[PDB]
Nucleic acid binder design. Structure first.
Ligand SMILES: [Cl-]
Ligand SMILES: [Cl-]
Ligand SMILES: [Cl-]
Ligand SMILES: [Cl-]
Ligand SMILES: [Mn+2]
Ligand SMILES: [Mn+2]
Ligand SMILES: [Mn+2]
Ligand SMILES: [Mn+2]
Ligand SMILES: [Mn+2]
Ligand SMILES: [Mn+2]
Ligand SMILES: [Mn+2]
Ligand SMILES: [Mn+2]
Ligand SMILES: [Mn+2]
Ligand SMILES: [Mn+2]
Lengths: 97, 78, 108, 104, 93, 91, 83, 98
DNA sequence: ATCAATATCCACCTGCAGATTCTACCAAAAGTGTATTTGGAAACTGCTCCATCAAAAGGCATGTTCAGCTGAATTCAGCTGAACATGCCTTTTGATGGAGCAGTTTCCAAATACACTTTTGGTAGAATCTGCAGGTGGATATTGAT
DNA sequence: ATCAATATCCACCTGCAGATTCTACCAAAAGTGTATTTGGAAACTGCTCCATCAAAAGGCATGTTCAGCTGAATTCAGCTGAACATGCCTTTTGATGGAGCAGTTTCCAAATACACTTTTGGTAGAATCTGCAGGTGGATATTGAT
């Protein structure tokens, strides 16, 4: 049969998703998530379709940017695997925590 | 609903961020990070909505909210 | 005509409502300014001033000082989660830093 | 004839920009006669600079229309435009870069 | 020439929270910078709010919303209380 | 509801007569122009107030540009601004 | 009058070490001191450039504290205590 | 001949300087630096004393804050020694240089 | 690197579907023609306060010596995370029809602006007030070698 | 374990540089009057939004292997910390000399004001094309192996 070694498909996915621009989180779960969070401030608010779109564009752009800095922290520790400690370091430098 | 943000979804975000290998603890950590980010943005966006005496959150409310935290977003009216 | 009554006293404030109103007017923040706007703003500025002074005053006492110095202001802000958040991009001159040594650096 | 944008040799609206400057700089404030012209010229320059680099990429990918992706590539590909615009370009993605320690 | 400052008002507030405590000139300068900073933040946010909603008037409502945007949590609740109280006391002639 | 769409499209035809632009890319250009305008106007506003002036002139815009634009962009922007004002004041 | 040269080297090794100590640093590589001097100069260049810009706009030949304070605020480095 | 072990005095210095607030860079050499840099922009500039003092407060606060992040990057790589590599990482995540 | 052998890209194409471009109102708004006012430049001038010098003390940078211990390689395996195929489904797509809530007018009582005329809280400078910086000590750890 | 050597903690002291309080003049809030906006408060719109719902179409969750990554462990060269003498140079304080803020007065070039007409740009459908769907035929590119 055929079997790709660990890292080959991973490197392939990186090239594929860095080349494209589409949203990577499914819309309905994100929309549902936004509404739950919002209702803890104000129950049953109306949301424009573009409003959720803006929130998702920002959310993904934020996380992608965080994963970049997270990756840098992993590499700095001579690792290839990102860990919670990498995220925690990146967010600390940013002033997020 | 925070579990609705699936592992392969979080994975795709990491790939675009150029991450090759991912710890299993990352996904729960990412969901926690995403929630705080959303809470802060939505808290401000809803605040803009109430001031306008509206019951509908517009895209401009979000843009204004993102701008206030130094997370300027292009392409949604403002 | 009637005896002068300051807007601050009318609002029960220590911060000058009139001066704040003038500053809103000459900053050209808007074409028109409401009557209650400088009242509200002066009250907020006064309370936030009180909050920092309270905690800074406390820090001076535990250092057994009767005079607040920048160090006390810094100790007050960085030890309070919400004041630290509010002034997270602000440098306090002669404030120094909060004592903090990473555990891994300490001896065995 | 003749519009203020025409007399300054611009495509960007001097009149609208003048009115915008006249907004939050109230009637108690003032706006110079050439301030709008100068401001218009800067906006048009920056717009042209971004459009040129973006237009190049759209043709370098054999596409007739400029897309958000082309704008993102043009900005992050230019040192000064990149530092100027730390905003999030919607639907622009990221610039393809893999760290050299990740490649076998 | 006269240079205005918030010094006398900060000192009045100081005597209210710590009647025994004084303050150095450099620490007073920091308090003045603080008051001017918060003023600038709130007024600026209220200005944009009016502009966003196409209002020509900055009222206490714009100030309140700006406060809820700029102050992080319990500080916002307490500031709104002091703000509302001062207004209600002021509008009570 | 105002927009810079027409003017962005006109400039595009100057630098790329053969090239079009997507609707979403236009919205980005609109956001860009609005953002830069706010930055410059805001800085120009502060410049005037710092110097106790009530008038925003092209001199305030120029200084604001020098503060906001990073290097070569600043030089050319200042040149384009001066160039446009000179041509404007001619007629 | 007198010429100012090479003053970034006036930022001594013990001075940089003291800064690191307040930063909580326990051990310092030898290459840090040149790097710190480089980082500092870039920072000072950026802040002073804007400050002088405010000075030139005001048609002054004297940099004021407010020029510096304004320059620091524009770069997201708000400083308290100088007016 | 008494001799403290490596790191002992270093930790001692950390607690001393984290306890105090005084400027760690000498005033006069810092003044020369500011004047040198500024006169490279505009010749024959004068300085208010408070202007230079403002720059020093801001400069030291910036460097101290940077050494904090730098330290965390070093610890992250399981080191006790800060290196240029650590500074470059800290400033990169800050968005100061990439 | 051959040699062969799968698994994926990935650019030569195509044909409508759906975005863009083009069209045409028509109210918003820019432009115009005058008339009037005014912020702010300019020309002094007073007076901070800034630059530079000087010395003198002593705090502290500098340069050196040296070994403690750290960073850098290096090795190894336990185990975690990647690759994968397979069923189950949550999300996706797409109407249908209500509808809730945008935004839009047209009136006035309430609110705010802006000037005049007085008054007083706020400031500058002088006069007092007095923490605490900087000095001196034992006491209490803390440290590193027998 | 004990000690010796050292540093830090903490309390003492006072006088003077810095902080507070006092004193009057006056800049600017306050009171009072018009004139001018403004934002509700009705009574009405067509519109994106919510809700199913009906399936259905990719997309996730799941378990099983095993490749290889991370972390522990080991070794050693040499760099960096610690301690010291030496003496340069920062700190402190005072002096001049005067450049140049900042105050002040005049008065036009440069702004606003206003009542109009002319021009323009936002808008929604029609009219136009451009990619987005996919779809290969065919090298990449990876993989196990001789
Ligand atoms: Cl971890
Ligand atoms: Cl009000
Ligand atoms: Cl002008
Ligand atoms: Cl390094
Ligand atoms: Mn109290
Ligand atoms: Mn030079
Ligand atoms: Mn005048
Ligand atoms: Mn080690
Ligand atoms: Mn194995
Ligand atoms: Mn009085
Ligand atoms: Mn002491
Ligand atoms: Mn007077
Ligand atoms: Mn008139
Ligand atoms: Mn037209």
């Amino acid at each position: 049969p055929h079997r790709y070694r660990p890292g080959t498909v991973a490197l392939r996915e990186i090239r594929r998703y860095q080349k494209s621009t589409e949203l990577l989180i499914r819309k309905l779960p994100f929309q549902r998530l936004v509404r739950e969070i919002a209702q803890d401030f104000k129950t049953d608010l109306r949301f424009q379709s573009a409003a959720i779109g803006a929130l998702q564009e920002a959310s993904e752009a934020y996380l992608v940017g965080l994963f970049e800095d997270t990756n840098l922290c992993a590499i700095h520790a001579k690792r290839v695997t990102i860990m919670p400690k990498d995220i925690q370091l990146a967010r600390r430098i940013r002033g997020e925590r | 609903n925070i579990q609705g943000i699936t592992k392969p979804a979080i994975r795709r975000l990491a790939r675009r961020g150029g991450v090759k290998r991912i710890s299993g603890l990352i996904y729960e950590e990412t969901r926690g990070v995403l929630k705080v980010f959303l809470e802060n943005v939505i808290r401000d966006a809803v605040t803009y909505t109430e001031h306008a005496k509206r019951k509908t959150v517009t895209a401009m409310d979000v843009v204004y909210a993102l701008k206030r935290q130094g997370r300027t977003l292009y392409g949604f009216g403002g | 005509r009637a005896k002068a009554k300051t807007r601050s006293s009318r609002a029960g404030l220590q911060f000058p409502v009139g001066r704040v109103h003038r500053l809103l007017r000459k900053g050209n923040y808007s074409e028109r300014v409401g009557a209650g706007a400088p009242v509200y703003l002066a009250a907020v500025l006064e309370y936030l001033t009180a909050e920092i002074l309270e905690l800074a005053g406390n820090a001076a006492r535990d250092n057994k000082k009767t005079r607040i110095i920048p160090r006390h202001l810094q100790l007050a802000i960085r030890n309070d989660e919400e004041l630290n958040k509010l002034l997270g991009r602000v440098t306090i001159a002669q404030g120094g830093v909060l004592p903090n040594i990473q555990a891994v650096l300490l001896p065995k | 004839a003749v519009s203020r944008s025409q007399r300054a040799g611009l495509q960007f609206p001097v009149g609208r920009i003048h009115r915008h400057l006249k907004s939050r700089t109230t009637s108690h404030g003032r706006v110079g006669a050439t301030a709008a012209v100068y401001s218009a010229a800067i906006l048009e320059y920056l717009t042209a600079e971004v459009l040129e680099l973006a237009g190049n990429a759209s043709k370098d990918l054999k596409v007739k229309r400029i897309t958000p992706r082309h704008l993102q590539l043009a900005i992050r590909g230019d040192e000064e435009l990149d530092s100027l615009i730390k905003a999030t370009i919607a639907g622009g993605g990221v610039i393809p870069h893999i760290h050299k320690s990740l490649i076998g | 020439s006269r240079k205005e400052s918030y010094s006398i008002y900060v000192y009045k507030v100081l005597k209210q929270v710590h009647p025994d405590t004084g303050i150095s000139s450099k620490a007073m300068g920091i308090m003045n910078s603080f008051v001017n900073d918060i003023f600038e933040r709130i007024a600026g946010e209220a200005s944009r709010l009016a502009h966003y909603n196409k209002r020509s008037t900055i009222t206490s409502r714009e100030i309140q919303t700006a406060v809820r945007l700029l102050l992080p949590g319990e500080l916002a609740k307490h500031a709104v209380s002091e703000g509302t109280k001062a207004v209600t006391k002021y509008t009570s002639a």
